[PDB]
Design a protein around this nucleic acid. Structure first.
Ligand code: MG
Ligand code: MG
Ligand code: MG
Ligand code: MG
Ligand code: MG
Ligand code: MG
Ligand code: MG
Ligand code: MG
Ligand code: MG
Ligand code: MG
Ligand code: MG
Ligand code: MG
Ligand code: MG
Ligand code: MG
Ligand code: MG
Ligand code: MG
Ligand code: MG
Ligand code: MG
Ligand code: MG
Ligand code: MG
Ligand code: MG
Ligand code: MG
Ligand code: MG
Ligand code: MG
Ligand code: MG
Ligand code: MG
Ligand code: MG
Ligand code: MG
Ligand code: MG
Ligand code: MG
Ligand code: MG
Ligand code: MG
Ligand code: MG
Ligand code: MG
Ligand code: MG
Ligand code: MG
Ligand code: MG
Ligand code: MG
Ligand code: MG
Ligand code: MG
Ligand code: MG
Ligand code: MG
Ligand code: MG
Ligand code: MG
Ligand code: MG
Ligand code: MG
Ligand code: MG
Ligand code: MG
Ligand code: MG
Ligand code: MG
Ligand code: MG
Ligand code: MG
Ligand code: MG
Ligand code: MG
Ligand code: MG
Ligand code: MG
Ligand code: MG
Ligand code: MG
Ligand code: MG
Ligand code: MG
Ligand code: MG
Ligand code: MG
Ligand code: MG
Ligand code: MG
Ligand code: MG
Ligand code: MG
Ligand code: MG
Ligand code: MG
Ligand code: MG
Ligand code: MG
Ligand code: MG
Ligand code: MG
Ligand code: MG
Ligand code: MG
Ligand code: MG
Ligand code: MG
Ligand code: MG
Ligand code: MG
Ligand code: MG
Ligand code: MG
Ligand code: MG
Ligand code: MG
Ligand code: MG
Ligand code: MG
Ligand code: MG
Ligand code: MG
Ligand code: MG
Ligand code: MG
Ligand code: MG
Ligand code: MG
Ligand code: MG
Ligand code: MG
Ligand code: MG
Ligand code: MG
Ligand code: MG
Ligand code: MG
Ligand code: MG
Ligand code: MG
Ligand code: MG
Ligand code: MG
Ligand code: MG
Ligand code: MG
Ligand code: MG
Ligand code: MG
Ligand code: MG
Ligand code: MG
Ligand code: MG
Ligand code: MG
Ligand code: MG
Ligand code: MG
Ligand code: MG
Ligand code: MG
Ligand code: MG
Ligand code: MG
Ligand code: MG
Ligand code: MG
Ligand code: MG
Ligand code: MG
Ligand code: MG
Ligand code: MG
Ligand code: MG
Ligand code: MG
Lengths: 72, 109
RNA sequence: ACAGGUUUGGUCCUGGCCUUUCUAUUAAUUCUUAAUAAAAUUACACAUGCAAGUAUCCGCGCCCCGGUGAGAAUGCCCUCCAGAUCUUAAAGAUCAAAAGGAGCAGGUAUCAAGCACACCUAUAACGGUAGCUCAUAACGCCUUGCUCAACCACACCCCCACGGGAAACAGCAGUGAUAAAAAUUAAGCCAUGAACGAAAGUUUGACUAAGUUAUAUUAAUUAGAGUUGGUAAAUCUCGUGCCAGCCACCGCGGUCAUACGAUUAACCCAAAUUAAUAGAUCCACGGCGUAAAGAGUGUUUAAGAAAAAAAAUCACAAUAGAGUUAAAUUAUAACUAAGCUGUAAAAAGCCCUAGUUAAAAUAAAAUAACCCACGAAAGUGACUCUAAUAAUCCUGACACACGAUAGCUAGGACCCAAACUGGGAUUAGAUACCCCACUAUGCCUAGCCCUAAACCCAAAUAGUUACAUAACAAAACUAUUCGCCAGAGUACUACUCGCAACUGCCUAAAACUCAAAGGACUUGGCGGUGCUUCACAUCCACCUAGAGGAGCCUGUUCUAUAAUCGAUAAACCCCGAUAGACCUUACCAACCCUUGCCAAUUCAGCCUAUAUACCGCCAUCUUCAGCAAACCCUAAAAAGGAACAAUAGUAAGCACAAUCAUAGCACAUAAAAACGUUAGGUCAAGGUGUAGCUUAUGGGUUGGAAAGAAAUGGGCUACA
RNA sequence: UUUACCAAAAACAUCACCUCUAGCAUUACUAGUAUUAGAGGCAAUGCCUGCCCAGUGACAAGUUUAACGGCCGCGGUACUGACCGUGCAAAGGUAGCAUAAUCACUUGUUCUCCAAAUAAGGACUUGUAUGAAUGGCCACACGAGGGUUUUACUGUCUCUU
């Protein structure tokens, strides 16, 4: 009955898991590459703030922490 | 829903149109690439004469030739229209017959 | 919308898609004239002509009219008016830049934070506070002229033009390139408006009058286009034979097509008619158990809503600690036995094994419970104690704290269970079901992960049983809310943001494809579902005689031949044949004959194709009890319709039954056996529908066939 | 840290992770006592670390691979082979990664870079001789390591004075 809607999901979920195993490490590469764009666009968002606010350099005591690349 | 809710989301609007294969234009120019033939969907069967064209929008597409018999070669220009074929998957474009290098399907009298 | 078609064997329900109306472009087919209106691909490049002049100098004018929609979420509305200009005996008046806000104003939250975006000082450019905006949408991104007696904006590009590229028709004509997009390089200032003028008047590609165009109305002079399965107005004969083609949706074509091409008749528009693309129109003041939709739980902020009642208690199992152990299991000893464990049945396995007697640790909590408490949900039912169940009690988020199992990290635990893996079987294979081990893992402490069919698929808080049955199920509703749902897939997906996750969670699309996807229901059919009762040559058990091996008879099937056909699962196979040496005879090989059997016939004759066109005869379910008109019922009806202390059914008809036949009975056999099923068999019994053959697919003579390497069904005769 | 005097590295060490060995007293270890102390392994972090006890050791017949060490054929099938047959093994090489500092073929194929590249980077990839603590895979920072590009610079060079 309604099972036939649900059964679809089941297959459609299962066939996903399989994919996510085979494509797994490829997915890690792309993901970490995507955080490597992330942190950078964060950076530009701040540099644009100094260079709009007129200061050449970053304000005193600014290391600009990496949040997106955080691990452990 | 409730009134407040209908206020927060306002009145329903009807969604702007999704354009067809012709992208809003009633017809289009095209340049043939290769004439070939395709097989219909299930409950019925034939083999239809079909074509590939480039359009003034630069895009390449599959279009169909209505009628029996034709003279169609590469680089020949045609006028195409937005008629959708029911027989075939995803063939939404049709060559208008009687203009350019496609003359009317020839009378047998 | 007065709606219509379209999901299914069928009926409702939900639900998209499509048709019927009106408008604009372009195209294909056609087009007689005039009149009125409107003329438009292209902020791409622009040959030639012209669009600003007037006037006694000076001066006044010279994107004003006119063009375009490039740009900008631009802006509509509504205050308040500087300055320009007109009038004039100094204040009236026409535009109205800029500055402003009651209110309204394109999409997108997968753009959620912007990043100095505020204020106090009147001190006179220095100081002083720490603000401002924003989930009632700030800040973005995408696309866009307009709300139309007009309004907004641009004027070669760099938003702005000092400067730079560079050398400007988005004035009227016209021209390249480009695009589905095609007006005259035309005439005058005669009317109006404008610019100057004292004034006649001068100029004006604004404009007026033409010229070009079926682009729309009017009118006649003018007839051509589409359609004819259904929705939806209207059809005949051929041709083609799942081919060539056709359709907006359903769909049409497989040899008899009203859907195709072409006729014939008709229908409906009409100087137009169809096709294609956009509009106008079109959701939800509907809904959320089963159909898409009530988030896993609770509280609060914002923001709302409100008569009176609205704190009483466990019939005792919230949660967190600290301690405790009843039955079982097991270490490990002591006796005894050689087996023990395990399945439908066996192997493997263990014999450091089993039984009995002893015994802690860990784990898990019989019975009470046929109870219905507690907790917000997840959850909670061995024992005792300590701590302890928010709120004078409406709703409430993305904020705040929780959240079963499984999972991750570190440290312990390990009787038992167990993914996994390894053996053993089961099997075509068995990565499983069945057995044997044994691990992560269930257990404790700390920290995560934040998902469930987290479901009672039924939101919270007041109410009522009044109206009322789509269907089922947990009967039907108001009121205040908050959350959610715009066909089906694609999709517990791709991108985004956030998160102690980095095969995760959360939030969540589109290209593409389809005309459906779905909820409930009805009748069958089926079920290696359960239950009852049966099978009487009938399934098992049981009785008798055979087949399959052999020889031979005969029928198929293959091979062999110039050389029939048909049957071919039960329901073909000593079959049509209760009968082929010629004949029968359809067959092949040659030869011959063309009103060629008849009263007559541009007519005869055709064992030519169709048994899926049929009549006739039959097979079969089946020695099955039903099948069918006439009615009548059922808060609708697809359909169903019985109960004998009977609840809606009555019914002639036809089966079965009853009688006939087996020379009397009784029995048995024989016959009988409806309706339908298997497009079952046969156009070769014959007869015919449709198509074919007609000096031949017809009619005669003569001769020729039917051979076995096998393979097999059935028989007969045996093996004594 | 290393070859004083031809090698400073990609060798070694190292935080970390992991095995083994140890229940204890006056000279080491240690005036310590298993979170300790010795014999080694591999190199932090992050994700991981698959199957194999037959051989050889090692331990206590039996048990061990983060011990030494291993991790397959031969045919048939819709060019390939998910599927099938059969043999042999203790298991039959997984996750990754890949023309590599990886026998040969070899200047593998293609894309980018350059006017032209046996270079360099990206892919593809049976490497039948990759591959998982004789560690496999990414990644930060680091390097007088080893390669390639660009800027700038120059007597390196045209071509010397
Ligand atoms: Mg699927
Ligand atoms: Mg990505
Ligand atoms: Mg069409
Ligand atoms: Mg359906
Ligand atoms: Mg149907
Ligand atoms: Mg059905
Ligand atoms: Mg449709
Ligand atoms: Mg036209
Ligand atoms: Mg036009
Ligand atoms: Mg221009
Ligand atoms: Mg204007
Ligand atoms: Mg305009
Ligand atoms: Mg906005
Ligand atoms: Mg104003
Ligand atoms: Mg998105
Ligand atoms: Mg914009
Ligand atoms: Mg625009
Ligand atoms: Mg400009
Ligand atoms: Mg200038
Ligand atoms: Mg012009
Ligand atoms: Mg101009
Ligand atoms: Mg032109
Ligand atoms: Mg003129
Ligand atoms: Mg005119
Ligand atoms: Mg017209
Ligand atoms: Mg007209
Ligand atoms: Mg005419
Ligand atoms: Mg009709
Ligand atoms: Mg054919
Ligand atoms: Mg016919
Ligand atoms: Mg039709
Ligand atoms: Mg027709
Ligand atoms: Mg409505
Ligand atoms: Mg309901
Ligand atoms: Mg949807
Ligand atoms: Mg709920
Ligand atoms: Mg909630
Ligand atoms: Mg959920
Ligand atoms: Mg109230
Ligand atoms: Mg505790
Ligand atoms: Mg015991
Ligand atoms: Mg048993
Ligand atoms: Mg045994
Ligand atoms: Mg109980
Ligand atoms: Mg209970
Ligand atoms: Mg208390
Ligand atoms: Mg309470
Ligand atoms: Mg409450
Ligand atoms: Mg509340
Ligand atoms: Mg949890
Ligand atoms: Mg756990
Ligand atoms: Mg653990
Ligand atoms: Mg264990
Ligand atoms: Mg123990
Ligand atoms: Mg056990
Ligand atoms: Mg096994
Ligand atoms: Mg089997
Ligand atoms: Mg079974
Ligand atoms: Mg165990
Ligand atoms: Mg637990
Ligand atoms: Mg539950
Ligand atoms: Mg449930
Ligand atoms: Mg529950
Ligand atoms: Mg739910
Ligand atoms: Mg649901
Ligand atoms: Mg609620
Ligand atoms: Mg009521
Ligand atoms: Mg009913
Ligand atoms: Mg969708
Ligand atoms: Mg899930
Ligand atoms: Mg996801
Ligand atoms: Mg979020
Ligand atoms: Mg029998
Ligand atoms: Mg029987
Ligand atoms: Mg016999
Ligand atoms: Mg025999
Ligand atoms: Mg033969
Ligand atoms: Mg025969
Ligand atoms: Mg036959
Ligand atoms: Mg049959
Ligand atoms: Mg038969
Ligand atoms: Mg017989
Ligand atoms: Mg004969
Ligand atoms: Mg004949
Ligand atoms: Mg046939
Ligand atoms: Mg028949
Ligand atoms: Mg037949
Ligand atoms: Mg019949
Ligand atoms: Mg009866
Ligand atoms: Mg009847
Ligand atoms: Mg009836
Ligand atoms: Mg009698
Ligand atoms: Mg009788
Ligand atoms: Mg009988
Ligand atoms: Mg009878
Ligand atoms: Mg009978
Ligand atoms: Mg038949
Ligand atoms: Mg006949
Ligand atoms: Mg006939
Ligand atoms: Mg003859
Ligand atoms: Mg003869
Ligand atoms: Mg035989
Ligand atoms: Mg006999
Ligand atoms: Mg006999
Ligand atoms: Mg040296
Ligand atoms: Mg030294
Ligand atoms: Mg040296
Ligand atoms: Mg490592
Ligand atoms: Mg090293
Ligand atoms: Mg050994
Ligand atoms: Mg591999
Ligand atoms: Mg790779
Ligand atoms: Mg090599
Ligand atoms: Mg190797
Ligand atoms: Mg290993
Ligand atoms: Mg090793
Ligand atoms: Mg080494
Ligand atoms: Mg190696
Ligand atoms: Mg570091
Ligand atoms: Mg370096
Ligand atoms: Mg160094
Ligand atoms: Mg160094």
């Amino acid at each position: 009955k309604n099972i036939l809607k649900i059964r679809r999901r089941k297959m459609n979920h299962h066939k996903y898991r399989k994919l996510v195993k085979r494509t797994r490490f490829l997915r890690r590469k792309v993901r970490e590459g995507r955080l490597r764009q992330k942190q950078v666009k964060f950076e530009r968002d701040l540099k644009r703030i100094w260079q709009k606010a007129g200061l050449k350099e970053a304000p005193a005591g600014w290391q600009t922490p990496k949040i997106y690349l955080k691990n452990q | 829903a409730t009134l407040n809710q209908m206020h927060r989301l306002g009145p329903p609007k009807h969604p702007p149109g999704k354009m067809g294969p012709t992208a809003g234009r009633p017809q289009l120019k095209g340049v043939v690439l290769r004439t070939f033939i395709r097989k219909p969907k299930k409950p019925n069967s034939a083999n239809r004469k079909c074509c590939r064209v480039r359009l003034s929008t630069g895009r390449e597409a599959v279009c169909f030739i209505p009628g029996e018999g034709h003279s169609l070669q590469e680089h020949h220009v045609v006028l195409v229209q937005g008629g959708r074929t029911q027989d075939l998957p995803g063939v939404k474009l049709t060559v208008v017959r009687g203009k350019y290098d496609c003359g009317h399907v020839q009378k047998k009298k």
